[PDB]
Design a binder for this molecule. Structure first.
Ligand SMILES: NC(=O)C1=CN([C@@H]2O[C@H](COP(=O)(O)OP(=O)(O)OC[C@H]3O[C@@H](n4cnc5c(N)ncnc54)[C@H](OP(=O)(O)O)[C@@H]3O)[C@@H](O)[C@H]2O)C=CC1
Ligand SMILES: NC(=O)C1=CN([C@@H]2O[C@H](COP(=O)(O)OP(=O)(O)OC[C@H]3O[C@@H](n4cnc5c(N)ncnc54)[C@H](OP(=O)(O)O)[C@@H]3O)[C@@H](O)[C@H]2O)C=CC1
Lengths: 287, 287
């Protein structure tokens, strides 16, 4: 039932993942490059190993949560002789192409492969609300899905090994988008002596409602029909000029706004002024 | 539902506003540069004037809903001889500094002034929940509220005539940040084949959760303590690179992402790495 797992990487997230597996009843074998990181985990039942090969030999599922991909692929080489017959689960973050290169390496050593992107902070691992995106052979995922649940939620995005990274990084770009907009709003609000707490209620409500617009932008993106609904790219543009002028007269930098300006203006010059926001997506694809 | 109102401007939004006032019983007089947009309006009890001045002299509250502040100010200078004793409500979009100039102009000709941001589409006007932001002298608003409710939700946001524009545009900045990050994410997801209509559920849930960090960030902006929330500007600027890299791998521009990258790097160079995102706000201040 609770299958034996290996955790390679005893950093902040490594120790939260390993703890989560012990707290779930999985016999957890850990390993770190530097010693001294497993005292509370070993006192919970975890076994610390001295060799990375030793560790990986003690699990049918090898969770890897190292620093970058550079570290990861080095370490996994040292274990390459014993890797065959286990599933790799790289919860280390990276690019989608890196995930796709490691999938080849793994499959050339007779190891299955799953990539993951943790949408959670170490402090939430094991507890509700944690999300870890996963990508890889659907086969491999179904088998590990329950093991992986010890971390939180397991959401599979497809057999593209880079699918976890891609949704991880895209969800970051969205997050940074909203926050970027919000901090500029706050900067404008603060420039005029207006307290920030107090505006955020109104912001959340506004943004919550705006989120209901996305299913229609989704449609037009996938459809091709970039038809408007009451505010076409050309109108939205004129509105952005006031936003740039309000920021320039209150003493706030337009730096976060200037890309959005150019993408709107470029859709006007492209022929989408009477179209909807969905037509701005392939405008970001220079390929 | 009984103060006499004048609508200068019979575009799409203009015709909404006036029909909402007629639908409330308000005695309403309408004017548009181009004649022939009054049919339904007059048939509902309204009255169309020929000169803006005639129209302004038949109403106490003068709702202005024209094309830009230039058009507005041109039109209002025509009616300045007859603007004394009246209350201007400029529902035409604009900047904070523009409202404050219109205020002083009206006081100088004997008129009261509220500025207005319509956070609604013309079809929502009159319907409950259509949001319009007003700012100006407070007792002017309190006397107008029952008229202003014809259009829907009237909110007063300060004696500063510039306040409604500052809140309209600041919520616009916020909404364009989120759309920006959604569009950049969809670009990325679409470059790999992922249909966006299936991605939108995961985006909405993800961004809805990320809205929870705002009330913390706001306290930081207001307090001065940009204490980390765990994730720090210095680590939020170490996965901005995998995002940048994945964006390139999929043929997607980094245009909407370079300003956040730079701001995050500026904060590190300012000693705010261990601080949280709330520090970025006072770095958005034009030096
Ligand atoms: N921390 C977080 O909140 C989040 C992190 N992640 C991702 O998780 C991964 C790990 O982050 P985190 O746990 O905080 O990392 P840490 O900074 O805590 O440490 C990284 C891990 O890599 C090990 N390591 C570093 N260099 C080497 C090396 N040359 N050879 C072998 N092992 C090495 C470290 O052991 P040593 O003691 O020897 O350095 C440590 O176990 C990253 O890819 C990160 O993006 C996921 C989401 C958020
Ligand atoms: N529509 C919307 O969804 C939103 C609109 N608003 C605000 O409402 C305003 C009106 O929008 P909407 O009704 O859709 O715009 P329209 O383009 O439908 O109408 C614009 C108005 O401006 C008038 N106008 C244009 N040029 C002149 C001029 N030189 N002299 C006099 N009048 C002139 C037009 O009169 P004419 O018929 O003769 O051209 C018309 O009444 C916007 O500019 C904005 O400030 C608020 C938020 C969103």
């Amino acid at each position: 039932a609770r299958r034996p797992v290996t955790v390679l990487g005893l950093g902040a997230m490594g120790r939260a993942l390993a703890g989560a597996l012990v707290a779930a009843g999985h016999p957890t074998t850990v390993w770190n490059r530097t010693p001294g990181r497993a005292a509370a985990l070993t006192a919970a039942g975890a076994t610390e190993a001295g060799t990375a090969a030793e560790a990986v030999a003690a699990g049918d599922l090898v969770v890897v949560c190292l620093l970058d991909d550079e570290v990861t692929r080095q370490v996994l080489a040292l274990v390459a002789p014993v890797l065959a017959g286990r599933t790799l689960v790289n919860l280390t973050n990276g690019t989608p192409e890196q995930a796709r290169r490691l999938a080849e390496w793994a499959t050339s050593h007779g190891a299955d492969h799953l990539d993951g992107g943790i949408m959670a902070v170490p402090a939430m691992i094991g507890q509700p609300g944690a999300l870890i995106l996963y990508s890889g052979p659907e086969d491999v995922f179904r088998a590990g899905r329950e093991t992986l649940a010890a971390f939180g939620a397991a959401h599979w995005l497809g057999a593209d090994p880079g699918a976890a990274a891609l949704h991880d990084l895209a969800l970051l770009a969205a997050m940074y988008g909203m926050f970027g907009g919000y901090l500029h709003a706050v900067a404008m609000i603060r420039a005029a002596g207006v307290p920030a707490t107090g505006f955020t209620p109104l912001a959340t409500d506004w943004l919550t409602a705006m989120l209901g617009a996305l299913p229609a932008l989704a449609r037009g993106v996938d459809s091709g029909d970039h038809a408007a609904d009451g505010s076409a790219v050309g109108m939205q543009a004129a509105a952005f000029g006031n936003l740039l002028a309000a920021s320039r007269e209150g003493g706030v930098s337009t730096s976060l706004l200037e890309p959005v300006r150019r993408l709107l203006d470029d859709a006007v010059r492209a022929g989408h002024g009477a179209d909807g926001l969905s037509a701005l997506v392939d405008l970001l694809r220079q390929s």
